[PDB]
Amino acid sequence: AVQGVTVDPYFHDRVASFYEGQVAIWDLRKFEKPVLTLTEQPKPLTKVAWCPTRTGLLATLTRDSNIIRLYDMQHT
Amino acid sequence: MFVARSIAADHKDLIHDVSFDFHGRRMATCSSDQSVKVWDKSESGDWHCTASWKTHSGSVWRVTWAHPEFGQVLASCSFDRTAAVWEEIVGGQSHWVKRTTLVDSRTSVTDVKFAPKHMGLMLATCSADGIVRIYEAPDVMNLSQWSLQHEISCKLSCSCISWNPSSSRAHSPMIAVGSDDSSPNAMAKVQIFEYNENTRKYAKAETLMTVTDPVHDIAFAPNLGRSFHILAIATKDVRIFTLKPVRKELTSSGGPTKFEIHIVAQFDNHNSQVWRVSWNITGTVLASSGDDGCVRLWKANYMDNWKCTGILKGNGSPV
Amino acid sequence: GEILYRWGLREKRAEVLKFVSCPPDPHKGIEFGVYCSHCRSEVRGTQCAICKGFTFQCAICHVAVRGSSNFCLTCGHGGHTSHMMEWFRTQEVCPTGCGCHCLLESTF
Amino acid sequence: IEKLTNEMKEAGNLEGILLTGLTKDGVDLMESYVDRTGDVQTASYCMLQGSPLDVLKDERVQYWIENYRNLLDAWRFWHKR
Ligand SMILES: [Zn+2]
Ligand SMILES: [Zn+2]
Ligand SMILES: [Zn+2]
Ligand SMILES: [Zn+2]
């Protein structure tokens, strides 16, 4: 996964990537294997973006979809 | 026929959950900064804060009161997989002291609730892994000791739980658990467990097949001496269901009691994901809050039909 | 302290006697026990030893009682001091419906 | 009389007490009325008027009385209780 690399504004050590319908998260301090992997979507992903006004919030939009999927990574 | 007003209470962070005491003279509020505040109402009718402290390392989801017969006890669930019990000690400035913590959950503790008074001092905690744990304190004079009495697996992500407030001698204890899983498959999202005295174990009794959308809130209504049970479910549309027990044959007493399920009201005026549902003291008025920033109060009519009675906005401006 | 008591001032006597190093001995005689509100057993204390719950509950507020309390020896009912004072300020029957005139049966 | 009494019992109108009287049928009628209305104060007060001991021995009337007492306690009307 090398597309859509982005860093959480609140956590500078958190990065995200996505290949096809699968999305992975990495921690730059220990970036050897992906920290977590989101559930693969049927339609390929199209955009991934972190929320700047809310901590640990990620948004994803896929191809030909009328719904945007939000993920709360603030658990840890 | 509902009018609104703003209470002169000052909060610095976003308020997550608010809860009343039994007599309605004490309020407990959870903030977004892992903070808990207690407010008391004066004789003149004004509200004043009396305590404040930080509780957990993670976010604080729910905080609830206990019955006054056991004193002043609060229970708080946290996203840090913990559930803390706090008791107030005054010597007079109030000094709340934590008495016990349950961390048996392997996932984030999603909900925490207290059992009815007639069943002793019990507590239930539903976690995100699909585990509901019911613990009891054998001694009411020693808050620091607790024992895990029951554990139930739901095979689905628990999101909310509710006890049955019935206190009759003919109704076994009942607990209902919802789910917020958004799996594409059409699966049941509400199940009910009824305790069995002959086995001293809780068993699944009925599953709501008609509910397949994710469920955010479930609320039993006060019994108040009726012959059946009233349940409210919060989803994309608010639903009301009635459960009536069937006459148990005297030939043999077996497993869970059979019930007849009928829907009596289904409102979709919110046109969004309803978030909270609550009952009044008498179980005659239902309050619902959804994503539309509006609060809807529903009540029955002369023809025993359910219709909206009040509409309000989050800002307090009447509609 | 004895001189103060002879003078008629009582509170000062207690205040002075609170500084005595040697404590006195407890009363050896008649004592009061409470029937448990749950197991109905004889419990010598504010908390039951069997049911582990509160044994004494107010007859007015129906809350557990832990401090000062008053009760009728003839009827066996009682509760919080302030609550019962307020109740008997105007009324003259036992507030639990026992029918006992607790004032006339208690004020000996 | 039988038909009208059955209809009133299945209807839940307090006026049918004249037919039934303060018996088990009256208890069922009051139960239906509470189911429709939820008023326990009136049922509690009416059931106490000269009812025989066996009639007063039902669990439902005791439950209604206890619910009324609990509600009154939840309002701090202790003297009324
Ligand atoms: Zn006991
Ligand atoms: Zn007496
Ligand atoms: Zn008495
Ligand atoms: Zn009292």
Swiss-Prot record, chain B:
Q: Name one GO biological process term.
A: positive regulation of TORC1 signaling
Q: Which UniProt keywords apply?
A: Cell cycle, Cell division, Centromere, Chromosome, Chromosome partition, Isopeptide bond, Kinetochore, Lysosome, Membrane, Mitosis, mRNA transport, Nuclear pore complex, Nucleus, Phosphoprotein, Protein transport, Repeat, Translocation, Transport, Ubl conjugation, WD repeat
* Residue windows of the WD repeats: 10-49, 55-91, 104-145, 153-203, 210-251, 269-308
Cross-link (Glycyl lysine isopeptide (Lys-Gly) (interchain with G-Cter in SUMO2)) at residue(s): K12
- Report if keyword Cell division is assigned: yes
Q: Which residues carry this modification: Phosphoserine?
A: S172, S183
Q: Which GO terms describe its molecular function?
A: structural molecule activity
Which Gene3D superfamilies does the protein's record reference? Answer: YVTN repeat-like/Quinoprotein amine dehydrogenase
What InterPro entries does the entry give?
G-protein_beta_WD-40_rep, Sec13/Seh1_fam, WD40/YVTN_repeat-like_dom_sf, WD40_repeat_dom_sf, WD40_rpt
Q: Which GO terms describe its cellular component?
A: cytosol; GATOR2 complex; kinetochore; lysosomal membrane; nuclear envelope; nuclear pore; nuclear pore outer ring; Seh1-associated complex
Keyword Phosphoprotein in the entry? The reply is yes
Q: Where does the protein end up?
A: Chromosome, Centromere, Kinetochore; Nucleus, Nuclear pore complex; Lysosome membrane
Q: Which domain of life is it from?
A: Eukaryota
What controls its activity? The GATOR2 complex is negatively regulated by the upstream amino acid sensors CASTOR1 and SESN2, which sequester the GATOR2 complex in absence of amino acids. In the presence of abundant amino acids, GATOR2 is released from CASTOR1 and SESN2 and activated.
* PANTHER family on file: NUCLEAR PORE COMPLEX PROTEIN SEC13 / SEH1 FAMILY MEMBER, NUCLEOPORIN SEH1
Family affiliation? Belongs to the WD repeat SEC13 family.
Q: What is this protein's name? A: Nucleoporin SEH1
Q: Which organism is it from?
A: Homo sapiens
UniProtKB/Swiss-Prot annotation, chain C:
Coiled-coil portions: none
* Residues reported to bind Zn(2+) 4: H77, C94, C98
Residues holding Zn(2+) 1: C36, C39, C48, C51
Q: Per UniProt, where does Zn(2+) 2 bind?
A: C61, H80, H83
This protein's name: GATOR2 complex protein WDR59
**Species in which this protein is naturally found:** Homo sapiens (Human)
Its biological function? As a component of the GATOR2 complex, functions as an activator of the amino acid-sensing branch of the mTORC1 signaling pathway. The GATOR2 complex indirectly activates mTORC1 through the inhibition of the GATOR1 subcomplex. GATOR2 probably acts as an E3 ubiquitin-protein ligase toward GATOR1. In the presence of abundant amino acids, the GATOR2 complex mediates ubiquitination of the NPRL2 core component of the GATOR1 complex, leading to GATOR1 inactivation. In the absence of amino acids, GATOR2 is inhibited, activating the GATOR1 complex.
Can you state the subunit structure given in the record?
Answer: Component of the GATOR2 subcomplex, composed of MIOS, SEC13, SEH1L, WDR24 and WDR59. The GATOR2 complex interacts with CASTOR1 and CASTOR2; the interaction is negatively regulated by arginine. The GATOR2 complex interacts with SESN1, SESN2 and SESN3; the interaction is negatively regulated by amino acids. Interacts with DDB1-CUL4A/B E3 ligase complexes.
Which family does the record claim for this protein?
A: Belongs to the WD repeat WDR59 family.
* Zinc finger residue extent: RING-type: 55-107
Curated annotation (Swiss-Prot), chain D:
Q: Where does this polypeptide localize?
A: Lysosome membrane
Describe, as the record does, how this protein assembles with itself and its partners: Component of the GATOR2 subcomplex, composed of MIOS, SEC13, SEH1L, WDR24 and WDR59. The GATOR2 complex interacts with CASTOR1 and CASTOR2; the interaction is negatively regulated by arginine. CASTOR1 and CASTOR2 convey leucine availability via direct interaction with MIOS. The GATOR2 complex interacts with SESN1, SESN2 and SESN3; the interaction is negatively regulated by amino acids.
The family classification in the record reads: Belongs to the WD repeat mio family.
The protein's role, per its UniProt record:
As a component of the GATOR2 complex, functions as an activator of the amino acid-sensing branch of the mTORC1 signaling pathway. The GATOR2 complex indirectly activates mTORC1 through the inhibition of the GATOR1 subcomplex. GATOR2 probably acts as an E3 ubiquitin-protein ligase toward GATOR1. In the presence of abundant amino acids, the GATOR2 complex mediates ubiquitination of the NPRL2 core component of the GATOR1 complex, leading to GATOR1 inactivation. In the absence of amino acids, GATOR2 is inhibited, activating the GATOR1 complex.
Record protein name field: GATOR2 complex protein MIOS
Q: Look up and give the organism this protein is from.
A: Homo sapiens (Human)
The lineage, from the top, is:
Eukaryota, Metazoa, Chordata, Craniata, Vertebrata
What gene is it encoded by? MIOS
